[PDB]
Design a protein around this ligand. Structure first.
Ligand SMILES: *[C@@H](CC(=O)O)C(=O)N1[C@@H]2CC[C@H]1CN(c1nc(OCC34CCCN3CCC4)nc3c(F)c(-c4cccc5cccc(C#C)c45)ncc13)C2
Ligand SMILES: Nc1nc2c(ncn2[C@@H]2O[C@H](COP(=O)(O)OP(=O)(O)O)[C@@H](O)[C@H]2O)c(=O)[nH]1
Ligand SMILES: [Mg+2]
Length: 170
């Protein structure tokens, strides 16, 4: 069989959510992608030998808190918390996005992976150990990625699928 996974990519504007998503869907780097458009994208892959359909919601748009948007976000089975390693403010915002996921999911156990993107850039301001400590505080995996080179991209999405699998087994 194939298993479908609804993944949601969240994080501050400009961190590479769309670039990561399009790397997964299309296997190359799209540097200027519709900064204002929120869409979902589907891709069949194979993860640990299991055919997997990834349905990826690339978030964007206005900050809105409503019953309708909560219920749409609630359909995510797992979430990528993305910041950029040259952008300390995006790192500081991670806690807010995690907070919102727990609320709409109404569970302390939501599959999540912390993603530090833009690892190809030399101007690093977020130390890998600091991001690891944040991930430890949440009990989730941390993966460094470059949507530009594709390093870490499959690991980030596939690790999230493995976290969802753990959750579904309960
Ligand atoms: C900006 C587009 C542009 O103008 O260039 C854009 O696409 N954004 C911005 C950040 C991400 C994306 C969507 N909006 C947004 N911003 C959030 O936080 C922004 C800050 C900064 C000002 C105050 N605000 C609090 C600290 C950070 N947060 C969210 C947000 F939480 C959601 C959302 C809403 C309801 C439920 C949710 C459940 C799970 C996850 C998310 C997410 C993400 C939820 N939607 C947008 C958002 C501005
Ligand atoms: N060097 C580098 N640039 C990136 C990377 N990911 C995204 N970008 C650039 O960062 C900017 C924002 O990317 P985007 O995908 O729109 O982020 P989003 O707002 O979170 O959807 C764009 O100019 C991208 O070309 C990366 O891994 N490396
Ligand atoms: Mg985008």
């Amino acid at each position: 069989g194939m298993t479908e996974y609804k993944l949601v990519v969240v994080g501050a504007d400009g961190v590479g959510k769309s670039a990561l998503t399009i790397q997964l869907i299309q296997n190359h780097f799209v540097d200027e992608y519709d900064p204002t458009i929120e869409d979902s994208y589907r891709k069949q892959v194979v993860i640990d030998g299991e055919t997997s359909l990834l349905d990826i919601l690339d978030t964007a748009g206005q900050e809105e808190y409503s019953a309708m948007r909560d219920q749409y976000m609630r359909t995510g089975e797992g979430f990528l918390l993305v910041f950029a390693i040259n952008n300390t403010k995006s790192f500081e915002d991670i806690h807010h996005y995690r907070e919102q996921i727990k609320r709409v999911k109404d569970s302390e156990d939501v599959p999540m992976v912390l993603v530090g993107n833009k690892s190809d850039l030399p101007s690093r301001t977020v130390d890998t150990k600091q991001a690891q400590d944040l991930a430890r505080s949440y009990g989730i995996p941390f993966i460094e990625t470059s949507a530009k080179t594709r390093q870490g991209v499959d690991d980030a999405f596939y690790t999230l699928v493995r976290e969802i699998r753990k959750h579904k087994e309960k």
